[PDB]
Every structure is written in structure tokens, then in C-alpha cells.
Amino acid sequence: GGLTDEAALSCCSDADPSTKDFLLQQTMLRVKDPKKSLDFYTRVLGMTLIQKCDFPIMKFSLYFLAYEDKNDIPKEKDEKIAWALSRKATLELTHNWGTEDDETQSYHNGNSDPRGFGHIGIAVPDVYSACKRFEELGVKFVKKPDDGKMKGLAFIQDPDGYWIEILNPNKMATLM
Amino acid sequence: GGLTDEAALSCCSDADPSTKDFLLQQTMLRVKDPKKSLDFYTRVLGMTLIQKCDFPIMKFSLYFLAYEDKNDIPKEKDEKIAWALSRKATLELTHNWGTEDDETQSYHNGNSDPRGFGHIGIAVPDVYSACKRFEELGVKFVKKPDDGKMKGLAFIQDPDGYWIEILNPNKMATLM
Ligand SMILES: COCCCn1ccc2cc(-c3cc(-c4ccccc4)cc(=O)n3O)cnc21
Ligand SMILES: COCCCn1ccc2cc(-c3cc(-c4ccccc4)cc(=O)n3O)cnc21
Ligand SMILES: [Zn+2]
Ligand SMILES: [Zn+2]
């Protein structure tokens, strides 16, 4: 039903040299309550808060989370922004002020109509031990590692309900 | 209002040692037409198609795009999957078979009600030269670099309408 491998490659062009230093820097998700999101991403997932930016006229804050050593965060405020925003693979959480206190408000995770965004995914050394720890911490699951046909791969959800895939790259090929 | 820097830090925890090797591997977006999406991400953005996986019973294809040298892609199939799925900062595009032929179908970019996911962002050496080339290539813009308040920061759109931030970490706007 889909493209063949050769048809897909027929649509691919070699990377133009003007793009050689481009990097996929961030994925932005809006979060209802930053206190709950910061606790989940740092305590449960082990990410580090590398930069916090506040925009008082726009009435929002940005929280940059990444798998980085906090000791690599520069001291100078200008060098800190240039370093945080040049890290690959960051998660940018947007807090629109006041959502945490609004009962009628909630964000949409993209996995039910209207669909679009699906998930972020974390590569781990051991899906089963990571998931046993998530169960112990009361994390909500979308798919446990041994549920469904795709055994050894899981999906959990964050406080806003966004999906997070948990995968071990060294054990994926046997699923084909 | 927003959180203070100290209040945000109090919500954070140091990383449990069992998460020390976790990495943010992928961001998944559903795409209506893989031919259009592959052309955009490779020719316009300069990403490389590092892995394509087809699931005949799930009725979908997965395309993994990343800023990687095509010469680093392994030759053998199982080695290829383990390498592609262990790269940081990949973009996973999901093609649910048949959407390209459904005139009434379209994905939602998360930027209009109901909101959630907002965008991916690419860090570039210079926003102006990057955007000059995007203009020459007929890319659709949400925000040109000098439109509105924040200068030197742009937002473009992919073929499904997902927003893509174009930023230069060395030339970000001054924070209040
Ligand atoms: C509970 O509903 C969850 C969504 C449906 N669903 C179930 C399993 C599954 C795996 C992949 C999947 C497979 C793979 C994969 C598997 C084997 C080899 C190579 C890639 C990579 C990947 O990123 N993803 O997301 C994608 N959707 C999946
Ligand atoms: C087209 O409407 C888009 C939504 C509203 N909007 C306008 C400008 C703008 C910049 C950032 C922004 C600023 C920054 C930033 C700016 C200065 C210092 C540090 C971070 C990082 C970042 O990832 N983003 O997304 C986020 N939303 C922004
Ligand atoms: Zn952003
Ligand atoms: Zn995935």
C-alpha cells in the first residue's frame, strides 16, 4: 500500500551543502502545569532543565529539557542561551500563564482526532527494567512492553497525556 | 504569572542513575503524502533518509530522517535499524497507507484549537541566508525573519502544515 524503498529514495535529494551545519534542535509541546511537567521529565525521565526563558508581554515561559550534564551549562547568561539553543534533541515545554488554574483547559496529544503529532521517543538500554521502574513510580502506560504484538517496545504518557515511546535500538530489528 | 527560576528548580530532580544513558531519539509526525514530505525534508531542509520500515498488518510506513552523513548508513539491514534507531534527534514520519488518495483527509498541526504540539526547530548558522534560500524554493512562511517583534527568527511550514522554527542560537533576542 505504501511506497517501495526505491520509490521513496527517488523522492530524496542529497543534502545541499548550505544546510551542512543544520541540526534538529527542539520539539515544542505546550504543557498545562510546568511544575508537574518539570517533575516528570527530570525525576521520571532523567532529563536536565538547561534553560528557562520568560516572556512577560506574551505571558508565557519556555523550559528547555535535554539529556545534558548540568556541569556543562555555562556561567555567563549570553553564553548560556547560545549553548542551550545549540544542543541537539531538546524538548521545549511552553507554559501559557494561567492554564494550571483553568478547569476547562487541556492540551490535545495528537493521537485522536484531529491527529497530527504522535510522540517523542527515548532510547534506553533496557525497555523492561525502565518500564518496571515506571510502574513503581505510578507512570500511566499507553502500551506496556509485553502488551500487543510489538513486544519489547512501550509507550507511556506525560502529565498532559503526550505519548512517549520507550525503545531499545539493539532489539528493534527482530520485530521485523 | 509564571514560575520564578527558584520555584522551577524546586520542581526538578537530579537524574536517577538508571536513566544515565537515555537519549531523546525521535519526534514522530504523521504525514499525508510521503513523496511530498521526503522531498521537503531532504531537498529543502537537508536531512537524510536513514531508515524506512514498512508494517503490512499495521498498514503504515515509518520514515526516519536525520542530520547524518548518508555514508555513515550501514549496509546490512539489522545493523542499519540499530544504527538509525540509536541516532539522537531523528524525525519519524508516519505514513498511514491511503491518506494521499483521501481528498477530505488532512493532519492538524497543533497551532489552532485544539492545541498541543507546536513545532520542531532547526538551528542554523544564519537565519537570513537560510530563509533567502527557502524563499527561492517557494517555501511557505508563518513568520519571516524580521516580521513582528522578534527579529532574526523565522517559522516555515512543511507539506502537512507543521510549523518549523528556524533559529540561530548565537543571535537570539535579548530576554526582559
Ligand atoms: C498503542 O498504540 C501505539 C501506536 C501503534 N504502535 C504499536 C506499536 C508500535 C511501534 C511503532 C514503532 C516501531 C518502530 C520500529 C520497530 C521495529 C524496527 C524498526 C522500527 C519504531 C518506532 O519509532 N515506532 O514508533 C509505532 N507505532 C506502534
Ligand atoms: C509565529 O508565532 C509563533 C508563536 C509566538 N512566537 C513568536 C516568536 C516566538 C519565539 C519563540 C521562541 C523563542 C526562543 C528564545 C528567544 C530568545 C532567547 C531564548 C529563547 C526559543 C524558541 O524556541 N522559541 O520558539 C516562541 N514563540 C514565538
Ligand atoms: Zn521553539
Ligand atoms: Zn516512534
Resolution stated for this PDB structure, in Å: 1.5
- Contact list in B for residue A8 (CB cut-off 8 A) is 34, 38, 49, 52, 61, 63
Beta bridge partners of A53: A62
- CB < 8 Å to A34, chain B: 3, 8, 11
Residue B71 CB partners (closer than 8 Å, separation 6+): none
With beta carbons less than 8 A apart as the criterion, state whether A66 and A122 touch.
no
> Is the Cβ atom of A162 under 6 angstroms away from ligand 1?
no
**Total Cβ atoms within 10 A of residue A150:** 15
Number of residue pairs across A and B with CB atoms under 8 Å? 291
Residues of A in contact with B22 (CB under 8 A): 45-46, 67, 122-124, 130
Q: Minimal CA–CA distance to B65: which of B31, B107, B32? A: B31
Which residues does residue A29 pair with via DSSP β-bridges, in sequence order? A93, B117
Residue A66 has phi, psi (to 5 degrees) of -160, 160
Candidate of B153, B156, B170, B175 to mutate for ligand 2, largest count of ligand atoms within 8 Å of Cβ: B153
Residues B44/B139, Cβ–Cβ less than 8 Å: yes
Cα B63 to its chain centre, rounded Å, is: 12
Q: Under a CB-based contact definition with an 8 Å cutoff, are residues B122 and B166 in contact?
A: yes
Nearest-CA residue of chain B relative to A37? B11
Angle at B19 between CA A106 and CA A129, to 5 degrees: 95
Rounded CA separation B105/A140 (Å): 31
Task: Confirm or reject contact between B134 and chain A (CB < 8 A).
Answer: no
- B119 known ligand binder: yes
Do A142 and A157 touch, CB atoms closer than 8 A?
yes
Cα A157 to averaged position of ligand 4 atoms, centre (Å): 13
Q: Look at the block and give the residue holding cell 539491514.
A: B77
CB-CB neighbours of A62 under 10 Å: 18
With H, G, I as helix, E, B as strand and everything else as coil, classify residue B163: strand
Strand partners of residue A166:
A122, A154
Q: CA quadruple A129, A132, A138, A143: dihedral positive or negative?
A: positive
Rounded Cα distance, A89 and A121, in Å: 11
Please report the residues numbered 21 through 40 in chain B whose beta carbons come closer than 8 angstroms to any beta carbon of chain A. 21-30, 34-35, 38-39
CA dihedral angle for residue A20, residue A22, residue A23, residue A26, rounded to 10 degrees: -170
Q: CA angle, A24 as apex, B16 and A43 as ends, to 5°?
A: 15
- How far is Cα A132 from Cα A152, in angstroms, rounded to an integer? 12
What are the DSSP calls for B33-69, one per residue?
-HHHHHHIIIIIT--EEEEEEEETTTTEEEEEEES--
Residues A124, B81: C-beta atoms closer than 8 Å: no
Q: Cell 508565557 sits at which residue?
A: A60
- Which of A40, A67, A37 is CA-nearest to residue A137? A40
How far are the Cα atoms of A24, A69, A100, B136, B143 from residue A89, in angstroms, in the given order? 7, 14, 26, 28, 23
Task: Specify the residue for cell string 523522492.
Answer: A11
CB neighbour burial string for A5-14, b if at least 16 within 10 angstroms, e if fewer: eeebeebbee
CATH of the domain at A125: 3.10.180.10
Given a contact cutoff of 8 angstroms between Cβ atoms, the answer to whether B43 and A16 are in contact is yes
* Of B91, B22, B101, the residue nearest B62 (C-alpha): B91
**Which residue's CA lies nearest to atom 15 of ligand 1?**
A172
Residue holding cell 535579548?
B174
Contact A1, B98 (CB under 8 A): yes
One-letter amino acid at A22 equals F
Burial B25-35 (b: 16+ CB within 10 A, else e): bbbbbbbbbbb
- Domain count along chain B: 1
Torsion angle of C-alpha atoms B165, B168, B171, B176, degrees rounded to 10: 30
Residues of A belonging to the active site? 165
H/E element, B167: strand B163-167
Q: What range defines the domain where residue A74 resides?
A: 1-176
Helix (H, G, I), strand (E, B) or coil at B113: coil
A138 touches chain B (CB under 8 A): no
Q: How far apart are CA A166 and CA B23, in angstroms?
A: 10
**B128 interfaces chain A, CB cutoff of 8 Å:** no
Backbone angles phi, psi at B165, to 5 degrees: -75, 140
| Helix residue spans in B74-173 (DSSP H) | 77-84, 127-136
Per-residue H/E/C for chain A: CCCCHHHHHHCCCCCCHHHCCCEEEEEEEECCCHHHHHHHHHHHCCCEEEEEEEECCCCEEEEEEECCCHHHCCCCHHHHHHHHCCCCCEEEEEEECCHHHCCCCCCCCCCCCCCCEEEEEEECCCHHHHHHHHHHCCCCEEECCCCCCCCCCEEEECCCCCEEEEECHHHCHHHC
- Other CB atoms within 10 Å distance of the CB of residue B139: 18
Instruction: Report the alpha-carbon distance of residue A5 to residue A2 in Å, rounded.
Output: 9
Which grid cell is A63? 523550559
Dihedral in degrees, nearest 10, Cα atoms A7, A13, A19, A24: 0
Elucidation method: X-ray
Q: Which of A128, A94, A75 is nearest to B115 (CA)?
A: A94
At A53, the amino acid letter reads C
Omega of the bond prior to A17 within 30 degrees of 0, cis?
A: no
Instruction: Tell me the C-alpha distance between B152 and B148, whole Å.
Output: 10
Judged by DSSP in three states, B110 sits in coil
- Rounded CA separation A123/B22 (Å): 6
